[PDB]
Amino acid sequence: GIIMPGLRRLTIRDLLAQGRTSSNALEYVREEVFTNNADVVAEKALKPESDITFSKQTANVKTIAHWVQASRQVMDDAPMLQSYINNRLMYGLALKEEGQLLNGDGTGDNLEGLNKVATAYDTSLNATGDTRADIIAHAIYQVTESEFSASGIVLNPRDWHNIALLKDNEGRYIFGGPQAFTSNIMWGLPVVPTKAQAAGTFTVGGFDMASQVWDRMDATVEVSREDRDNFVKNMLTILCEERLALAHYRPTAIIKGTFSS
Amino acid sequence: MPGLRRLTIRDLLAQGRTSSNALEYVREEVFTNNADVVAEKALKPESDITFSKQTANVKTIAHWVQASRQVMDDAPMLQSYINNRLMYGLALKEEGQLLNGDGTGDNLEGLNKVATAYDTSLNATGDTRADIIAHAIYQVTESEFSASGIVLNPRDWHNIALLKDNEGRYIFGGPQAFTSNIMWGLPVVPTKAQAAGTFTVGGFDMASQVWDRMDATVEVSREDRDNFVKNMLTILCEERLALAHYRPTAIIKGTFSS
Amino acid sequence: SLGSDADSAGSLIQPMQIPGIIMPGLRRLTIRDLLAQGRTSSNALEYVREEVFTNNADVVAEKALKPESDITFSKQTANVKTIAHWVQASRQVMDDAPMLQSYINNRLMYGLALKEEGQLLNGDGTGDNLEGLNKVATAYDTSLNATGDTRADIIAHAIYQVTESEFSASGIVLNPRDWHNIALLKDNEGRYIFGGPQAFTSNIMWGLPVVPTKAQAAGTFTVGGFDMASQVWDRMDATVEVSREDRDNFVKNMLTILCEERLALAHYRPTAIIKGTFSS
Amino acid sequence: SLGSDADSAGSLIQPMQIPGIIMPGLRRLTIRDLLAQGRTSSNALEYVREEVFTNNADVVAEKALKPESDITFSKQTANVKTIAHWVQASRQVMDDAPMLQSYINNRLMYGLALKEEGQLLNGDGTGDNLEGLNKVATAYDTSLNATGDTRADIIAHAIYQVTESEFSASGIVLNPRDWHNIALLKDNEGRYIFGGPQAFTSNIMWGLPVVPTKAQAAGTFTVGGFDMASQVWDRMDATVEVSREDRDNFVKNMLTILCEERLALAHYRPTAIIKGTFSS
Amino acid sequence: SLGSDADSAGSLIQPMQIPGIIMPGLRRLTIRDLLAQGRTSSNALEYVREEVFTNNADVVAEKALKPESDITFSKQTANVKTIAHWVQASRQVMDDAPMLQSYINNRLMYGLALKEEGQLLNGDGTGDNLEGLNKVATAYDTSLNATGDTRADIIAHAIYQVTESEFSASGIVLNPRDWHNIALLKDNEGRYIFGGPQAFTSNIMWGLPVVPTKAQAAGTFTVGGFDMASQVWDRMDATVEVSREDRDNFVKNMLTILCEERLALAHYRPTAIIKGTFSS
Amino acid sequence: SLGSDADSAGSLIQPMQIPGIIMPGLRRLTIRDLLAQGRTSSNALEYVREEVFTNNADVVAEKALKPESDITFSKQTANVKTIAHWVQASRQVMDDAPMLQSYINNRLMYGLALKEEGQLLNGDGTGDNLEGLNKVATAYDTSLNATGDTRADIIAHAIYQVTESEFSASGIVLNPRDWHNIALLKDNEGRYIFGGPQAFTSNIMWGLPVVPTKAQAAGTFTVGGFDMASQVWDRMDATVEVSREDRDNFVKNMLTILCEERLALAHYRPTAIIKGTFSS
Amino acid sequence: SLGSDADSAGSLIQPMQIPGIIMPGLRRLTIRDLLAQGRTSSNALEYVREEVFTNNADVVAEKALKPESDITFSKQTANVKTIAHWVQASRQVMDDAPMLQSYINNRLMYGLALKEEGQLLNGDGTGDNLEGLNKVATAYDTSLNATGDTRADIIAHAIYQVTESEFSASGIVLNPRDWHNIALLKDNEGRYIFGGPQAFTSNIMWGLPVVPTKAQAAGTFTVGGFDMASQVWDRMDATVEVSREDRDNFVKNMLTILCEERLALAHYRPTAIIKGTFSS
CATH number of the domain encompassing residue A201:
3.30.2320.10
Residue E71, Cβ density class (10 Å: 0-12 exposed, 13-18 middle, ≥19 buried): middle
Taking CA atoms, what residue in A is nearest to B232? A227
Q: Name E72's Cβ contacts closer than 8 Å, sequence gap at least 6.
A: E50, E51, E52, E53, E54
DSSP-assigned letter for residue E263: E
Q: What is the largest CA-CA distance in chain C?
A: 119
Instruction: Select from G133, G169, G168 the least CA-distant residue to G32.
Output: G133
With respect to residue B3, please indicate whether it lies within any of the assigned structural domains. no
Q: Are residues A20 and A68 in the same domain?
A: yes
For chain D, the residue count is 280
B155 contacts C207? CB cut-off 8 A: no
d(CA E111, CA E26): 10
d(CA B203, CA B245): 11
> What are the DSSP E strand ranges found in chain F?
16-22, 36-39, 44-54, 58-60, 70-79, 81-90, 138-139, 171-174, 204-205, 208-212, 220-224, 230-234, 236-243, 254-263, 265-267, 273-277
d(CA C94, CA C249): 14
Q: Which domain does F153 fall in, by range?
A: 137-229+269-280
- The reported resolution of this PDB entry, expressed in Å, is 3.9
> What are the DSSP E strand ranges found in chain C?
16-17, 36-39, 44-54, 58-60, 70-79, 81-90, 138-139, 171-174, 204-205, 208-212, 220-224, 230-234, 236-243, 254-263, 265-267, 273-277
Beta carbons of E172 and E222 less than 8 angstroms apart:
yes
Q: Name G165's Cβ contacts closer than 8 Å, sequence gap at least 6.
A: E25, G225, G269, G271, G272
D189 min Cα distance to partner chain G (Å): 11
With respect to residue F2, please indicate whether it lies within any of the assigned structural domains. no
Helix axes of F151-163 and G176-183: crossing angle, nearest 10 degrees: 150
For residues A55-64, one letter each, b for 16 or more C-beta atoms within 10 angstroms of the residue's C-beta and e for the rest, the string is eeeebebbbb
Residue D11 neighbours by CB distance under 10 Å: 10
Mark residue E233 as left, alpha or beta (left: phi above 0; alpha: psi -120 to 50; beta: remaining).
beta
* Helical residues (DSSP H) of chain A, grouped into ranges: 72-77, 79-103, 114-117, 132-144, 157-164, 207-210
d(CA A195, CA A12): 12
CB-closest option in F26, F200, F214 to B184: F200
With respect to residue E17, please indicate whether it lies within any of the assigned structural domains. no
Beta carbons of D110 and D26 less than 8 angstroms apart:
yes
The chains found to touch B (3+ Cβ pairs under 8 angstroms) are A, C, F, G
d(CA F50, CA F45): 17
DSSP-assigned letter for residue A164: H
Give me the torsion for CA of D24, D27, D28, D34, rounded to 10°. -150
Q: Name A43's Cβ contacts closer than 8 Å, sequence gap at least 6.
A: none
Residue E9, Cβ density class (10 Å: 0-12 exposed, 13-18 middle, ≥19 buried): exposed
With respect to residue A166, please indicate whether it lies within any of the assigned structural domains. yes
Instruction: Select from E54, E32, B95 the least CA-distant residue to D24.
Output: E54
d(CA F126, CA D241): 115
Chain C residues within 8 A of E63 when measuring between CB atoms = 1, 3
DSSP-assigned letter for residue C271: G
With respect to residue D2, please indicate whether it lies within any of the assigned structural domains. no
| β-sheet bridge partners, residue E250 | none
Beta carbons of F78 and F45 less than 8 angstroms apart:
yes
Report how far apart, in Å, the C-alpha atoms of B34 and of each of B142, F28, F103 are.
21, 19, 18
What is the secondary structure of F171-210 as a DSSP string? EEEE-HHHHHHHHT-B-TTS-BSS--TTSPPPSEETTEEE
Residue of A24, A222, A233 to mutate, testing the B interface (most B Cβ within 10 Å of its Cβ): A24
CA-derived radius of gyration, chain C: 27
CB-closest option in G10, G21, G190 to F50: G21
For residues G117-133, one letter each, b for 16 or more C-beta atoms within 10 angstroms of the residue's C-beta and e for the rest, the string is bbbbbbbebeebbbbbb
d(CA A186, CA A154): 11
Q: What is the largest CA-CA distance in chain F?
A: 121
Residue of C52, C54, C59 to mutate, testing the B interface (most B Cβ within 10 Å of its Cβ): C59
CA G95 to chain centre: 36
B173 min Cα distance to partner chain G (Å): 22
C:F CB pairs within 8 Å: 5
Q: Are residues D42 and D84 in the same domain?
A: yes
Instruction: Select from A68, E264, D55, E150 the least CA-distant residue to C118.
Output: D55
* Helical residues (DSSP H) of A43-183, grouped into ranges: 72-77, 79-103, 114-117, 132-144, 157-164
With respect to residue G99, please indicate whether it lies within any of the assigned structural domains. yes
Q: Are residues A200 and A90 in the same domain?
A: no
Instruction: Select from B86, B16, B100, B93 the least CA-distant residue to B60.
Output: B93
Residue D139 neighbours by CB distance under 10 Å: 11
Assign 3-class secondary structure to chain D: CCCCCCCCCCCCCCCEEEEEEECCCCCCCCCCCCCEEEECCCCEEEEEEEEEEECCCEEECCCCCCCECEEEEEEEEEECEEEEEEEEEEHHHHHCCHHHHHHHHHHHHHHHHHHHHHHHHHCCCCCCCCCCHHHHCEECCHHHCCCCCCHHHHHHHHHHHHHCCCCCCCEEEECHHHHHHHHCCECCCCCECCCCCCCCCCCEECCEEEEECCCCCCCEEEEECHHHHEEEEECEEEEEEEECCCHHHHHHCEEEEEEEEEECEEECCHHHEEEEECCC
Q: Are residues G71 and G105 in the same domain?
A: yes
DSSP-assigned letter for residue G141: P
Taking CA atoms, what residue in D is nearest to G63? D3
Chain C residues within 8 A of B174 when measuring between CB atoms = 193-194
d(CA F207, CA F212): 16
Beta carbons of D119 and D130 less than 8 angstroms apart:
yes
Q: What's phi and psi for B112, nearest 5 deg?
A: -50, -30
Residue C244 neighbours by CB distance under 10 Å: 13
Q: 3-state DSSP call for residue C149?
A: coil
Residue G17, Cβ density class (10 Å: 0-12 exposed, 13-18 middle, ≥19 buried): exposed
C191 contacts D57? CB cut-off 8 A: no
Q: How many helices (H) and strands (E) does chain G have?
A: 7, 14
Taking CA atoms, what residue in E is nearest to F61? E3
Q: 3-state DSSP call for residue A223?
A: strand
Q: 3-state DSSP call for residue E47?
A: strand
B154 contacts C146? CB cut-off 8 A: no
CB-closest option in D190, D191, D199 to E207: D199
Q: Are residues G51 and G179 in the same domain?
A: no
| β-sheet bridge partners, residue E254 | E90
E:F CB pairs within 8 Å: 5
F111 contacts B33? CB cut-off 8 A: yes
Q: 3-state DSSP call for residue G256?
A: strand
**Which is it for the CA torsion A215, A220, A225, A230, positive or negative?**
positive
Beta carbons of B225 and B33 less than 8 angstroms apart:
no
Report how far apart, in Å, the C-alpha atoms of E173 and of each of E159, E251, G163 are.
12, 49, 17
Beta carbons of D257 and D104 less than 8 angstroms apart:
yes
DSSP-assigned letter for residue E15: P
- Residue F47: CATH number of its domain: 3.30.2400.10
Chain B residues within 8 A of F84 when measuring between CB atoms = 35, 38, 44-45
For residues F32-44, one letter each, b for 16 or more C-beta atoms within 10 angstroms of the residue's C-beta and e for the rest, the string is eebbeeeebeebb
> E strand or H helix at G88, and its extent?
strand G81-90
DSSP-assigned letter for residue G165: T
CB-closest option in B89, B106, B177 to C57: B89
> What are the DSSP E strand ranges found in chain E?
16-17, 36-39, 44-54, 58-59, 70-79, 81-90, 138-139, 171-174, 204-205, 208-212, 220-224, 230-234, 236-243, 254-263, 265-267, 273-277
How far apart, in Å, do the first and last CA atoms of chain E sit? Answer: 68
DSSP-assigned letter for residue G221: E
d(CA C16, CA G69): 83
Q: 3-state DSSP call for residue A121?
A: coil
DSSP-assigned letter for residue F99: H
Report how far apart, in Å, the C-alpha atoms of B54 and of each of B25, B26, E139 are.
6, 6, 93
Instruction: Select from A175, A253, A166 the least CA-distant residue to A209.
Output: A253
d(CA C100, CA C93): 9
C194 contacts B2? CB cut-off 8 A: no
Q: Are residues E64 and E74 in the same domain?
A: yes
With respect to residue C1, please indicate whether it lies within any of the assigned structural domains. no
Instruction: Please enumerate residues of B whose Cβ is less than 8 A from a Cβ of A.
Output: 70-71, 73-75, 222-223, 225-229, 231
Chain C residues within 8 A of D73 when measuring between CB atoms = 21
Beta carbons of E262 and E157 less than 8 angstroms apart:
no
d(CA B3, CA C168): 8
Q: 3-state DSSP call for residue G279?
A: coil
Beta carbons of A148 and A245 less than 8 angstroms apart:
no
E4 contacts F62? CB cut-off 8 A: yes
Beta carbons of G219 and G175 less than 8 angstroms apart:
yes
d(CA D75, CA E200): 67
d(CA D56, CA D150): 41
Q: What's phi and psi for C135, nearest 5 deg?
A: -65, -55
d(CA F221, CA D72): 86
DSSP-assigned letter for residue F35: S
d(CA D4, CA E226): 30
Amino acid at D16: M
Instruction: Please enumerate residues of A whose Cβ is less than 8 A from a Cβ of B.
Output: 22-24, 63, 65, 67, 217, 224-228, 237, 239, 241, 243
Q: Are residues F44 and F173 in the same domain?
A: no
Instruction: Select from A191, A185, A195, A203 the least CA-distant residue to A121.
Output: A203
Report how far apart, in Å, the C-alpha atoms of D122 and of each of C176, C213, D131, D274 are.
31, 34, 8, 13
Residue of B68, B71, B74 to mutate, testing the A interface (most A Cβ within 10 Å of its Cβ): B74
Mark residue C192 as left, alpha or beta (left: phi above 0; alpha: psi -120 to 50; beta: remaining).
beta
Beta carbons of C192 and C248 less than 8 angstroms apart:
no
**Which is it for the CA torsion A67, A70, A76, A82, positive or negative?**
negative
With respect to residue D261, please indicate whether it lies within any of the assigned structural domains. yes
d(CA D149, CA G74): 68
Instruction: Select from E73, E255, E275 the least CA-distant residue to E173.
Output: E275
Taking CA atoms, what residue in C is nearest to F4? C62
Beta carbons of E221 and E151 less than 8 angstroms apart:
no
Beta carbons of G87 and G249 less than 8 angstroms apart:
no
Instruction: Select from E209, E176, E206, E212 the least CA-distant residue to E194.
Output: E206
B:C CB pairs within 8 Å: 106
CB-closest option in G82, G130, G199 to F207: G199
F202 min Cα distance to partner chain C (Å): 29
Chain F residues within 8 A of C62 when measuring between CB atoms = 3-5
* Helical residues (DSSP H) of chain G, grouped into ranges: 31-34, 91-96, 98-122, 133-136, 151-163, 176-183, 249-252
G3 min Cα distance to partner chain B (Å): 7
D184 contacts E188? CB cut-off 8 A: no
Q: 3-state DSSP call for residue B139?
A: helix
d(CA B93, CA B108): 12
d(CA A193, CA A15): 13
Number of domains in chain F: 2
Report how far apart, in Å, the C-alpha atoms of B13 and of each of B95, B148, E60, F232, G174 are.
12, 9, 88, 43, 58
Beta carbons of F275 and F140 less than 8 angstroms apart:
yes
Q: Are residues A44 and A168 in the same domain?
A: no
Amino acid at A258: T
Residue of F60, F63, F187, F188 to mutate, testing the E interface (most E Cβ within 10 Å of its Cβ): F63
Q: How many helices (H) and strands (E) does chain F have?
A: 6, 16
Q: 3-state DSSP call for residue F222?
A: strand
d(CA C226, CA C173): 11
Q: Are residues F123 and F176 in the same domain?
A: no
CB under 8 Å, gap of 24 or more: what pairs does C243-249 form?
Answer: C244/C91, C249/C88
d(CA B139, CA B146): 10
Q: Are residues F179 and F216 in the same domain?
A: yes
Q: 3-state DSSP call for residue A247?
A: coil
Residue B89 neighbours by CB distance under 10 Å: 20
Residue C99, Cβ density class (10 Å: 0-12 exposed, 13-18 middle, ≥19 buried): exposed
Mark residue D20 as left, alpha or beta (left: phi above 0; alpha: psi -120 to 50; beta: remaining).
left
Residue G56 neighbours by CB distance under 10 Å: 14
d(CA G164, CA G143): 15
Residue G49 neighbours by CB distance under 10 Å: 16
CB-closest option in G50, G61, G204 to E198: G204
Helix axes of G176-183 and G151-163: crossing angle, nearest 10 degrees: 110
| β-sheet bridge partners, residue C230 | C267
Q: Are residues A167 and A112 in the same domain?
A: no
d(CA E94, CA F88): 108
Report how far apart, in Å, the C-alpha atoms of C258 and of each of C43, C250, D61, D65 are.
21, 16, 16, 12
Q: Are residues A136 and A260 in the same domain?
A: yes
CA F214 to chain centre: 9
Residue G54 neighbours by CB distance under 10 Å: 12
For chain B, the residue count is 258
